[PDB]
């Protein structure tokens, strides 16, 4: 059907990467990466 | 064969909720024993 669904997964997917990055960043006190 | 996209959004959506929950938990220290 329309590729609109590809847009919803894009935001939710990117959100998981950005949210996971902050989680790992805080997990390590060095926060070097 | 229908609402297939609903399955992808469900997994990605739940992933954002489970990650956000662990993120806020780390922000707030554990309550006193």
The answer to the question of residue B31 being in a domain is no
A3-21: b or e for each residue (b if 16 or more CB lie within 10 Å)?
eeeeeeeeebeebbeebee
Q: Quick one: which H or E segment has residue B18? A: helix B4-27
Distance from the Cα of B33 to chain A's closest Cα (Å) equals 22
Q: What is d(CA B12, CA A28) in angstroms, rounded to the nearest whole number?
A: 25
Domain count, chain B: 1
Here the tokens at position B4 are: 């297939």
Here the tokens at position B5 are: 């996209």
Q: Which domain holds residue A24?
A: 1-33
Q: What is d(CA A1, CA A4) in angstroms, rounded to the nearest whole number?
A: 8
Distance from the Cα of B14 to chain A's closest Cα (Å) equals 10
Say how many CA atoms lie within 13 Å of A3 toward its Cβ: 1
The answer to the question of residue B21 being in a domain is yes
**What one-character-per-residue DSSP string does A1-31 give?**
--THHHHHHHHHHHHHHHHHHHHHHHHSTT-
Judge whether B18 is closer than 8 Å to chain A, CB to CB.
no
Here the tokens at position A21 are: 């990055």
Q: What is d(CA A25, CA B27) in angstroms, rounded to the nearest whole number?
A: 12
């Amino acid at each position: 059907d329309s590729k609109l669904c590809y847009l919803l997964d894009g935001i939710l997917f990117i959100y998981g990467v950005i949210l996971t990055a902050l989680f790992l960043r805080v997990k390590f006190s060095r926060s070097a990466d």
